[PDB]
Amino acid sequence: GAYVLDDSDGLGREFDGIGAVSGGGATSRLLVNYPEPYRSEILDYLFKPNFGASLHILKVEIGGDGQTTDGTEPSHMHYELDENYFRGYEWWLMKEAKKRNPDIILMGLPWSFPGWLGKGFSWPYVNLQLTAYYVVRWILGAKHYHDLDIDYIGIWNERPFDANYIKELRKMLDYQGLQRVRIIASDNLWEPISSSLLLDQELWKVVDVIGAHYPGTYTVWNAKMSGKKLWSSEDFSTINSNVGAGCWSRILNQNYINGNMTSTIAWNLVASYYEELPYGRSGLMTAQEPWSGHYVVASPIWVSAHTTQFTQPGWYYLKTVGHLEKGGSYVALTDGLGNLTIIIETMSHQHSMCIRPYLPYYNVSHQLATFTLKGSLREIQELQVWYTKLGRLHFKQLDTLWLLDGSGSFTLELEEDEIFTLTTLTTGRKGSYPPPPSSKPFPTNYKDDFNVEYPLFSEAPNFADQTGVFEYYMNNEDREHRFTLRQVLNQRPITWAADASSTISVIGDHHWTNMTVQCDVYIETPRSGGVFIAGRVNKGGILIRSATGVFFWIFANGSYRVTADLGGWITYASGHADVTAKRWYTLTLGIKGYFAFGMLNGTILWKNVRVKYPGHGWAAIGTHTFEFAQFDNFRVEAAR
Ligand SMILES: *[C@@H]1O[C@H](CO)[C@@H](O[C@@H]2O[C@H](CO)[C@@H](O)[C@H](O)[C@H]2NC(C)=O)[C@H](O)[C@H]1NC(C)=O
Ligand SMILES: *[C@@H]1O[C@H](CO)[C@@H](O[C@@H]2O[C@H](CO)[C@@H](O)[C@H](O)[C@H]2NC(C)=O)[C@H](O)[C@H]1NC(C)=O
Ligand SMILES: *[C@@H]1O[C@H](CO)[C@@H](O[C@@H]2O[C@H](CO)[C@@H](O)[C@H](O)[C@H]2NC(C)=O)[C@H](O)[C@H]1NC(C)=O
Ligand SMILES: *[C@@H]1O[C@H](CO)[C@@H](O)[C@H](O)[C@H]1NC(C)=O
Ligand SMILES: O=C1NC[C@H](CO)[C@H](O)[C@@H]1O
Ligand SMILES: [Ca+2]
8 A cells, every 4th residue: 555665774785796707608709709889889788887687786697618508718827827807808898987977896616627627627616825825916907907906706507616715715815915805695596605604713704795696585583694795696597588677577576575595596697698509598698699780789788777777776775665466566765865766567477587596476566655765865856767667768858756745645557567766866868879770690701810919819710619718819930820828827727617628619590400511620639639610500508518410520649530429439431531630621511401411622532421301500619628739710601
């Protein structure tokens, strides 16, 4: 019936911000080679204040060279004694975010680790000091090379924590003058971190935030008892149609209401990865076509704005928040300066399902809501109004509501799948750029000779590594192949996902079915080394081990194989070939209907080999194991 909003009895918990995740894994892969002005426009919609999603928080993966859901991300230390703070795109992303919002909050978290940290095992807690040293290098690098202050550091994404590691990490941070950096744990479930904090005073002292993943808007008693800030440190992960926006809308409100969570962070920031990779199009917006410049400002952008444009970290929740009588919810916040923001959501069950978890049915129906401002809120008699309807009108500013009544009260008519923001703030704005170019398939003819002397990013565009790491490589001691692409891992990472046994980078249009792929390849390991080119590669990311297609392998022992799978269990053809290590060869692979052929240096090696059909997928390059190899003059012609 009537809902009292008051502050005379005090405030709720401090609000900590809304954010999103770039990483886990390579979710921002295709954003970096967007032409201007589009790339800058995309970033504005994400990070520019009073414009779009206007995010308060940016969380990034600390790359560990392993596969971490939609690709691998390069580490700052591939090997022992190796340090490089200019690989990948998270440095760039954080810097672009900070340019637009100097007050943005920055977080780092590892998914995987380079293999050498394991000292013989696939385990990051073998040498606590070594692993902490690795992580702290990254934070120092952020400051020293990019002028970035990292605000929070996590432990090991959705993986066991080690209490002694967390303590060593704190000691190491302090030792390097990073007392300011806060620790969030354990980016998994509420337990066992929450009970661990109650039982261990020393652990309690060094953990600042309990961050939980996909909590379904609820927390647990031990977490409440801890007295720690509680965050949904990863949520959402749902296709950014209207249903995803509904899910985002509902949990943004009810994570605090039901679970006392004062921050929610969406995976992921922007869908800049091939849509046929796992969890395709699960970003706040979509930007998966750098070749065309086409991007989509999806509904979740404006769902975000309803909170972010009218709240900042450091505001407080009112004690008076809750559910609506006929379904839906409301929250309210103030800044302690006279401002007030009210956020109301009525998302229906059929239009707000998240993937994790799925909620049992709940009813939502039309209703009236009366709000009465008590305490220091009564003195307010003007509120700006912002409105969104899903299923559609987005972030439209309505006529100002007046409370000149003296009643300090007002009433709203609510339907299903709606969002209302009522605020004293006058800075709201539905940011707008002209429409971007229409969607277009990946170019049916495509080439890259990798001839770039001072590349802006460490890897050639559109190549999405799914196991191993591929980089621009300059070799002064060779004129013909001075600038190539090199796979640089020489051992399996401490894995997060199930990385393939072979390295592989995919590129192009997953719809491609008839195609010709050509590349120069160079095997660096004598006797045992091997490389391939491939087409119709149908799976990647977390499922990269499941990839089928047509794979043309050559080996340094003078042999070749044609397989249906990346794992090489299934044979199409095999034989001998004049191939050794440390010599450049040109490979061609043609696939058309039921048949494939392969060429070595322009000369047929095999032809009319029968392959599964119908079938479709990307083109790819790679190496037999985690071994050095180079690639040059890549070309693909394909019919979609
Ligand atoms: C966090 O959780 C809940 C909110 O879901 C709060 O607990 C009580 O909520 C009921 C209504 O749901 C109120 O009538 C009570 O007054 C609340 N408890 C208290 C002590 O005020 C809870 O307060 C929030 N905070 C904590 C520390 O649990
Ligand atoms: C609401 O918030 C705005 C923005 O924070 C407040 O305006 C600021 O007030 C401080 C001092 O309190 C000044 O130093 C800033 O220059 C002001 N900024 C702007 C953009 O006006 C405002 O006082 C708050 N309260 C109300 C009732 O609007
Ligand atoms: C890929 O190539 C196959 C084989 O050439 C094409 O399938 C043939 O298409 C022609 C004309 O469309 C038909 O007359 C044949 O009967 C088809 N053969 C088979 C085995 O299906 C296929 O259409 C091509 N696809 C694309 C997208 O170019
Ligand atoms: C939802 O509530 C309305 C009003 O109480 C009722 O008419 C309707 O049947 C309910 N729907 C379901 C699925 O319970
Ligand atoms: O950490 C994660 N957790 C789950 C996401 C998918 O829902 C994604 O795999 C992400 O990397
Ligand atoms: Ca070259």
